[PDB]
Amino acid sequence: VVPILVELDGDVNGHKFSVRGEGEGDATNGKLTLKFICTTGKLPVPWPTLVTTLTYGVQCFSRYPDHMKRHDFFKSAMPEGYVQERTISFKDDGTYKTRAEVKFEGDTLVNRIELKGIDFKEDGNILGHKLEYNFNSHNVYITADKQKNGIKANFKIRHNVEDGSVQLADHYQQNTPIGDGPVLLPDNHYLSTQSVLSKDPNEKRDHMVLLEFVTAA
């Protein structure tokens, strides 16, 4: 078991919001349990749009098969951390540009994300908060690039809407290891992520109790 504390900030159409969260991840069992909270009074965009980014921002906890243990890249660069740049193009609802830094500081993992939102318009799903609290499992395809000496991930994420509309957003990610150690970049693989959400009625504050199960293949 490994504890994790992730603090991130994001600016969307002039609205600034910071979110801090804590939890634990079992790599052997391939499980992650997180709980977030926004210090600001209200968060502009729907929570899932950022919850998915926070979930996919860390893949070290994700369990890997025995044959893929040596193939993994995020664990190899874990001792010295890494920096990730993600472009998330929503379908007709603008685009997100995020820069993240992941590092095992002291004896605990730390994850710092900075998010920019652009091309947002009123009456959209993002602006109208029409997205519900449910989520969906997904698949992410990762492939190595020697020219960038890194790993590039790509996939499509389906976000649900109250009226039944489903928005397909394209996620692209590029990694760069902060350290100078061996890369051990995998040629190509796919990771399946299963996410569930729950809320704790003890506190009126929204909890976003988040559970992930990630498996590579």
Epitope: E132, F135, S137, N160, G164, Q194, V196
Partner: nanobody
Framework: VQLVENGGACVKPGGSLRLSCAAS????????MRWYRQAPGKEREWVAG????????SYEDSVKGRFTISRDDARNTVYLQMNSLKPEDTAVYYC????????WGQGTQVMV
């Protein structure tokens, strides 16, 4: 919780067939139902959805006004009507509903 699909068979151009998706383990009326369509060797694409409250349904531009899906809570089943048949319907269908952790139905295959 399990989802079962039935009513799928090949249709001649212009024909109308009815698909049915039923659930066992959870109340269908409490949560929203969705329908996906994917072709051989093609990415899955959302083809239809009905809101949890059932006030309105969401469809894409290609097929807006054809599926005309309906839902029965007493019957615990959602019915889909082909109406006009187009080549895009050649792709196979899937019935999806996510209560807690997501659940994917077995679906049925239909081709023109």
């Amino acid at each position: 919780v399990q989802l079962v699909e039935n009513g799928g068979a090949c249709v001649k151009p212009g024909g109308s067939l009815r698909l049915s998706c039923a659930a066992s383990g959870f109340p269908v009326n409490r949560y929203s139902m969705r329908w996906y369509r994917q072709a051989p060797g093609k990415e899955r694409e959302w083809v239809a959805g009905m809101s949890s409250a059932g006030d309105r349904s969401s469809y894409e531009d290609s097929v807006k006004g054809r599926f005309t899906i309906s839902r029965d809570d007493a019957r615990n089943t959602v019915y889909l009507q082909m109406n006009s048949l187009k080549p895009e319907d050649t792709a196979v269908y899937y019935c999806n509903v996510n209560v807690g952790f997501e659940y994917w139905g077995q679906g049925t295959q239909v081709m023109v």
